[PDB]
Structure formats: C-alpha cells, structure tokens
Amino acid sequence: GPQPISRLEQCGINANDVKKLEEAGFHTVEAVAYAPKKELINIKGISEAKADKILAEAAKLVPMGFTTATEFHQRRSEIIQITTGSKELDKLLQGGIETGSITEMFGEFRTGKTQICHTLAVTCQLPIDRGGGEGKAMYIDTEGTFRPERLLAVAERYGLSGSDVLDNVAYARAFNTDHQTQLLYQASAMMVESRYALLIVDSATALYRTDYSGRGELSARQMHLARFLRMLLRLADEFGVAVVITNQVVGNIIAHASTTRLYLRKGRGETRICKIYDSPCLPEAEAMFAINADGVGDAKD
Amino acid sequence: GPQPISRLEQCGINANDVKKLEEAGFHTVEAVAYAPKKELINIKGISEAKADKILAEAAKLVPMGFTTATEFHQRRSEIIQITTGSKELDKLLQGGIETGSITEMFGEFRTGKTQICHTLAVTCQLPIDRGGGEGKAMYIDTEGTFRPERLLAVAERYGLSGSDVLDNVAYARAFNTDHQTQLLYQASAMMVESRYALLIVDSATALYRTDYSGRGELSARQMHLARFLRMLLRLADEFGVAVVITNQVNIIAHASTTRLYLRKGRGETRICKIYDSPCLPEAEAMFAINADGVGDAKD
Amino acid sequence: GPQPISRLEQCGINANDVKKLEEAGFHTVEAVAYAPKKELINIKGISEAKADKILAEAAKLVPMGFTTATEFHQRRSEIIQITTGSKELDKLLQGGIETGSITEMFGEFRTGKTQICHTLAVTCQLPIDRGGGEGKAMYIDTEGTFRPERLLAVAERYGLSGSDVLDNVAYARAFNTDHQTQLLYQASAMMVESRYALLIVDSATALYRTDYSGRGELSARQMHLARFLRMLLRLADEFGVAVVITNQVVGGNIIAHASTTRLYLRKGRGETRICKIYDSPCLPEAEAMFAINADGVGDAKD
Ligand SMILES: Nc1ncnc2c1ncn2[C@@H]1O[C@H](COP(=O)(O)OP(=O)(O)OP(=O)(O)O)[C@@H](O)[C@H]1O
Ligand SMILES: Nc1ncnc2c1ncn2[C@@H]1O[C@H](COP(=O)(O)OP(=O)(O)OP(=O)(O)O)[C@@H](O)[C@H]1O
Ligand SMILES: Nc1ncnc2c1ncn2[C@@H]1O[C@H](COP(=O)(O)OP(=O)(O)OP(=O)(O)O)[C@@H](O)[C@H]1O
Ligand SMILES: [Mg+2]
Ligand SMILES: [Mg+2]
Ligand SMILES: [Mg+2]
C-alpha cells in the first residue's frame, strides 16, 4: 500500500494540479507528505494556498503520529531481505539486503562491485519464499560494464526464464551527472505502474569526477551530488525498494545517505572478503565469498 | 513542583482562555510565566489585556525573586542523572545525562551517536534508585536508523521485559524540518497523560541540510532551527525530561548545555570527550559498543 | 543507427553551427547528446542559448529513456567481433575484439603487443562472415616498429591481395603526446568519408614518459592523458570501431574504467606466448596459449 497519487484527487485536489505534481516528480501521497512547504510552492503554477490544501489532505491518508516501538518492530518483520547468492554473505546481512534503504559498496577496482549488482538484479525477481522480492529490477549504469549475458547465467542457477528476466530489468546508461539525476524522474513514474524491488547505480560517483575537475567547481558537484542522494532516499521511502550503489576507492556526502556500508577487498585466487563498515543494526564482522560463473557464490577453497 | 496550568484557572482566568494556551504549547503556570508579553499576543484569540492578567496571576504561584544559592543547590540535587550503560562514561558525566536540559552529541559518522540514543532509550525506564528515570522514552528519527532489535538487547542486559520496553518507547520519523517541528506539538500532549523521561532527536541537523540547500535561503533556515531549539528548551523546563540530540560534523552554542564529542578507537572501542559544559570538566572517557548496548571497554 | 549529425540540422539548428561541431570532434547526433553542457559552451563562437537548443533537439532524435534489458542484449548481439588469428585466443575473448570499446594489452617487452596489432590490422579487412569487420585499418605508431612486410605475410595466410591490403591501412607515427592527440582530429574526419574498423595506438603510454620526465610535471601529463583517453572512448561510441592500445609495464590507474578489456601477455617456451584477461565485465579470468608464426598470430604447435 504505497498510496497512489490518484487518491489525492479524491480528497479535494483538482486533477489539473495533480498533473503538475507528476511532472515535478511527486507520484504518491507519501511523496507530498515527505515534501516541506517550500517544495510545493517552488513548483510552477502552484500558490501557497494550493500547497496547504495538499499537505492537509495528504496527512489524512498517511498519518504521521507517534507509534509504539513494538509496532515498528513488527514493521521490520514485514521487510523483505533479498539474498545475495552466497549463504555466508547472507548470514552477514542477517538475512540479506534490506528493502527501503540505501546500501553502499565501496572497494578497489576489479574487486567485484559490478558483479554483485548483476547477481542482485536477478535474485530480486525470485519468489519471496526463496529470498527474492517478486519485483522488477532497475539498473543505472555509468561505466559501460552492463552485460545481459551475466544476468542469464544467474537466472539459470535459480531456474528462471532468461527471456522473462531480461523483460523485467530496466537499463539505462547515464552520460553525465545532469543525465544521471534526470533518470530518477523517469524512474519514479515507472515504479507506479509496475512493481520494482531493486535500484542499482553503478557507479554513483564515476561521473562526478570527470565533469567537475577544477578546484573552484568542487562546491558545485557537492550540491549536485547531495541533491542526487536525496532523491534516492525519497524513492526508497516511497516504494520500499532496495537501493544499491557502488563507489570506487583508490566522500563525506555518502556518509548519512547510505544506511549499510560494505567494504570489498580481494583475497587469494578468485575469493573475496567482505566487511561491514557503517550499520545501525549489523555488527562489525567479516564473511568470505567467491565470484563464480553462476554469479556471487560461496567460497570453495 | 512545576505548577500545572490548571491552577492558573483557579486565580481568575477563565478556563476557555486556558485551552488556547495548551494548544499553543503551554501546559504549566511556569510555562506561561516563562513567556514574555509578545509571545501571548501573537497567539490567535488573545488580546493584550488578557496577556497582562496571565502574567500577573502567574507570578503569584511562581515567584521570580532572588533566591539563596543553597536553595537553588537543593533544587539541583533533585535532578535525575540517567546512566549511559558504561561505568567509565557515567563518571565522565558526573552521574549521567541531566534531565531538564539539552545534551548535544556531535561527532563523525559511525562514531556511535545513534547507539548512545538507543541505549539511553532503555536505561531511562529503569528505576531511579537503579540509575534510571522512571519514565517512558520518545525517539524522533530522521535518518531511518531506528532499530527496535537494539532496544531488546539492552533490555535483556538489565533484565527488563522486552515487550514492556517496546510498549514504553514512542517512535516517529520526521520527513522534513516543518514535520520535525510539528512532531513536538504532539510530543507535548503525550507527556501530559503519561510520564516521560527522555526525548531523542536523531538527527536534529540532518533535515536542516537537505531542505535548505541554497545560499540565499541561509538566513531562513537559521530562524527555523532557532525556533525549534527554543521549543526543546521549553519542553525540558516544562516536564523536566532529558533532551538528547545528535549532530553530524553556532546556533546550538547557548541552546545546548552539554556537548559531547565522539571519535572512533581501535576496533569496536570508542572515545568520548566533553566539549562545552558549565559544571563538567574537560576530560575523556573510553567506552565500547557491544551486542548488549553501550558497555565498558575490556581489552 | 548512430544518427549522423547532418540529421540534427534538419530539426532547426543552422548548418553553420553544425560545422563548428565537426571541427570540435562531434560527427553524430548521439555525440552531441553524449556531451554535457560545458563541452559545447567552451567551444569558440557558441553561446549557452545555442548549446541548449542543440542538447534539447538532440534528445528528440536520440532518446535517453530506460530500455528493457532484452533490448540492450540485442544491441550487443549486433557488435562485430574481429578475429585475432588464433582459435584458442578467439575463444578466450568469447568471439574476438569487441568493437565500440577500448581493449588494452599490457605486457613486458618482446611479448607480442606489436605483433597482435599487425595481425588485427589485416583481419579487420576480412568479411564479417569470415570474422572480419569489412573496414579499413588505422595504425598510430610511437615506437617506430611498424613493418608493412609483416602485413603482407598475414595477407597471404588469409588469401588477400597484398596490394589491396596495404591500400586499406592508414599509417602515421606520433612524435610526441601533443602530436599523438592531434592525430585523433584527423582520424575523426577520415572515418566519415571512408569506413574504418580498427584504430591501433602502439604505444599509447610510451610518449607520456619520454616527454614528461620531471616530477613537478606529473599532474600535467595525467591531464593530457585523461583527455586523450576520453577521445578514444568517444570515437568508439561514435563510429562503433574497435580500439586497441598497447602499454609497457615495468599500467596506469586512469585507464581503469576507460578500458573495457585488459589483456596480459607473457612469454612461453620458444616463440609461444601466453595471454591472460585482467579486467572485464563479461569475460572470466582465464588464460590461453598462442604462438607467433611467419603468417602472423597463430595457434601453438608444440
Ligand atoms: N563471466 C565471468 N565468470 C566468472 N568470473 C567473472 C566473470 N566476469 C568477471 N568475473 C570476475 O569478476 C571481476 C569483475 O570485477 P568488477 O568489474 O565487478 O570490478 P568493479 O568493482 O566493477 O570495478 P570498476 O567498476 O571500478 O571497474 C573480475 O575480477 C573477474 O575475475
Ligand atoms: N549488534 C551489534 N553489536 C556490536 N556492535 C554493533 C552492533 N550494531 C552496530 N554496532 C556498532 O555500532 C556502530 C553504529 O554506528 P552509528 O550508526 O551509531 O553511527 P552514527 O553516529 O549514527 O553515524 P551517522 O548517524 O552520522 O550515520 C557501528 O560502527 C557498529 O560497529
Ligand atoms: N618474421 C617473423 N617470423 C616469426 N616470428 C617473428 C617474426 N618477426 C618477429 N617475430 C617474433 O615476434 C616478436 C616481436 O615482439 P614485439 O615487437 O611484438 O614486442 P612488443 O610487445 O612490441 O614489445 P615493445 O613494443 O614493448 O618493444 C619477436 O620476439 C619475434 O620472435
Ligand atoms: Mg564495474
Ligand atoms: Mg545515526
Ligand atoms: Mg610494441
């Protein structure tokens, strides 16, 4: 129950004003309730009086009162944890990737940040009883490393139709930072008509280094990156989907944006070691995994 | 003895005018005595004549004369200090978190600002004789980092019923600065029916960076934050509860009474340092983050 | 279908402004859509208003919306894979050299970086049904190791006219880094009038060590190399040709994401050589052995 924006018109908001909200980026009742007063006023063709009518009726459908901690604890029992393909890696995450939050994977090059994303892009279509999310996947690529054939190998592992998996994965390559943020506007509208479960941005920081290379323009890219991260957190709270982003390390804005940070480093041979950095519920522990032809699997020395 | 506002009606003020004061945020005689003349005039449906009647009769129940330092010293002896879970950390605070004042914890990410809040959200329910506050907990979250499972582990450490602990913790996530301030209005009404002891805002500065990002709007966000901090100080003086806020790293200079700096040590160990304080000396203390909550370091 | 830049003039942009885009390096509508806002504004005689009209109308011809994974799978199915001459080496690359992307071959001296380039310079002229690209070859040399006689021996192996093979190979030796980058401007104009299929730069890192030898100039050569690498990746997306560069490792961290497939070469017994794949999004870490024969790069024959 994400409260479609069409129900906001039933409260009293005229249908023409709803069109302005959809083109602005708001497609749910929870989105306008998330927005302050200044967000609706800045929209073209919306006065302060019209903004107050939206916030009042939006709070009726989505209440924001105080709830008991035992109630929010039961809300965590309804959270879906997507498997990563490795049993030892799933134990490290106390179940898997938590939906509705941003997960950051920072590590050296060639470690396997992109490989983990391709594996998760298929496991989200798995049934919920098998550790999936029963939703479509969304892959935003910036390195040119997207390979649909790698998705077919993961589908064969769990016995899913490779053709149906590719039909449920949306792909788009961002050419620049302005294009990278612009793709999120189309992403919000697509998640309203169909159910998605995973949003992948690989890489989320590559385009911010090539465009703004000067020293006086450092504050400019930080303003653009902060605005890009805020839209990711809004989409996570809006649709309850898992957000996975990659970062290349040879960065203080992705501190509070990410809810769970993962550090990847290379081990002996094809084995890799993963460690949890920042997390509110998971303890600092490590787990070993490997990168096989079937995707991300368990280590087999 | 904070003089509830119901006694103000007994002096001569009609009860209907008192209802307008409660909807504004004033629920005690000390609260309306705290407010100047301009605060009551700005309230809808209150004239200057009605405001003068309130302040005059409020001074009878709450006098504003000079008192001996030994008398105010005994009033500070009644202040409750909530334990933090670490014995070395409790010694640093000369007892623990002081109720009725704002405590700010500023530090880098992953230091443990949220972990201290979850630990204090359970230790505040302990009996006062056991180092608690004998009151419910209130958690206002802005990062999405609230974990009820962390509260259960701390409750099992001190031998408390996990179900009863979750029933005594109020949780609400603020989506923006306007929503963050709006939650305090509901918070004041909840503290009237039941006794609370701790108010947590994590983070108190995160939403003020996401909403107001421009440069021409810099003066606007400072006015909204200053008004938010004054409401926290008003709630602390009104109900005598502890206010704990986190900040990720000038307006919170005089607003905050005790500042705590957190930095990471080797492994799971953490180091805490006191920044600004009128009674606590500049000292440091070491603590750890265990599965049972915030405990002492054990090399 | 890369949408040539001449179609951008049909939308409303005057043809004279399009001429400035060709002199800058943009020859398709997908190229100006690839470029951000700052790239077009920095060009002499182009204002922000003219740049906004280009980017807006370019998005109309080349949409930048989300596509199904099955659609991008068919886009990779249309990519031409040029054979390397060794059957075991072609199996290692899941087909051959991928066009439209940069392929790096880093290895010690005498391993065979130059020999592989000469072999690919002839196999690209083969028919696509025979594993070729049906396009001309372009060789940018920096070591003075270009030998047309090696091209004639490879042409005799595949039964091609040696005279016609030499007529379809463009050669130019870069004397310095500034000359190395300047040759790419001439390369873009040549690929518009005639069809090319392969661009070879051997070596792509030799001139950046001899020219910039000081320590205070280290940050200067990295800016020039990074700008040079971006132009190679842009030409690959623009013309859909394969880009092969060689590097001596006694590599750089800037060619990390720029290169799509890295190959490591080491010497075996005799004339045999061993090849290994380093970084790749689709190819697994595996090794393959090959040899250097008089006919070019062939399979190992103990
Ligand atoms: N088909 C495959 N089968 C098995 N293993 C593979 C396959 N393809 C790639 N790998 C392995 O996965 C790794 C790929 O690393 P990856 O491309 O994910 O790095 P990355 O984190 O994306 O770095 P960057 O994005 O900065 O280039 C390689 O080291 C390789 O060993
Ligand atoms: N179950 C657990 N057992 C032991 N330690 C834990 C457990 N869960 C979390 N931790 C530790 O507590 C820390 C949590 O950091 P925390 O989330 O408090 O940072 P923070 O102050 O909220 O930073 P920010 O709010 O700016 O993101 C982690 O570094 C982790 O090592
Ligand atoms: N006509 C030929 N017949 C057989 N083998 C040959 C012939 N010509 C050259 N070779 C072999 O090919 C190899 C050439 O190595 P090559 O010049 O490709 O090294 P490289 O990778 O260019 O090193 P660098 O360019 O860094 O000096 C020689 O070792 C030689 O044995
Ligand atoms: Mg990658
Ligand atoms: Mg936190
Ligand atoms: Mg060579």
Numbering used by the authors:
A (entry chain E): 21 to 270, 289 to 339
B (entry chain F): 21 to 269, 290 to 339
C (entry chain D): 21 to 270, 288 to 339
From the manuscript:
An essential mechanism for repairing DNA double‐strand breaks is homologous recombination (HR). One of its core catalysts is human RAD51 (hRAD51), which assembles as a helical nucleoprotein filament on single‐stranded DNA, promoting DNA‐strand exchange. Subsequently, RAD51 is recruited to the DNA overhang to form a right‐handed helical nucleoprotein filament (NPF) in an ATP‐dependent manner (Bianco et al, 1998). The NPF is responsible for DNA sequence homology recognition in a duplex DNA, usually the sister chromatid, and formation of a joint intermediate that will serve as a priming site for DNA synthesis needed to copy the missing information (Benson et al, 1994).
To provide further insight into hRAD51 function and investigate its apparent ability to adopt different conformations in the polymeric state, we obtained a crystal structure of the hRAD51‐ATP filament. Remarkably, the protein crystallized in a monoclinic space group, with two complete turns of helical filament in the asymmetric unit. Thus, unlike previous crystal structures that contained a monomeric or dimeric RecA/RadA/RAD51, related to proximal protomers by hexagonal or trigonal symmetry, our crystal structure yielded information on the conformation of 14 independent hRAD51 molecules, in a filament state and bound to ATP. In the crystal, ATP‐bound hRAD51 forms a continuous right‐handed filament with seven subunits per helical turn. The heptameric repeat of the helical hRAD51‐ATP filament has a pitch of 128.0 Å and a protomer rise of 18.3 Å. Inspection of the 12 independent dimer interfaces in the two heptameric turns of the hRAD51‐ATP filament structure showed the presence of two distinct dimer conformations, alternating along the filament, in a qualitatively similar arrangement to what had been observed for yeast Rad51 (Conway et al, 2004). Comparison of the two dimer types by superposition shows that, relative to the first hRAD51 protomer in the dimer, the second protomer undergoes a rigid‐body movement comprising of a slight tilt towards the filament axis coupled to a small increase in twist. The pivot point for this composite rotation is centred at the dimer interface, with residues surrounding the ATP‐binding site displaying the least movement. Modelling of hRAD51‐ATP filaments constituted entirely of one or the other dimer type yields filaments with different pitch and rise (134 and 18.4 Å vs. 112 and 16.9 Å), reflecting a looser (7.3 hRAD51 chains/turn) or tighter (6.6 hRAD51 chains/turn) winding of the helical hRAD51 assembly around the filament axis. The values for the rise of the two filament models, at 1.84 and 1.69 nm, fit within the contour lengths measured for the two states of the hRAD51‐ATP filament in the optical tweezers (2.2 ± 0.6 and 1.4 ± 0.3 nm).
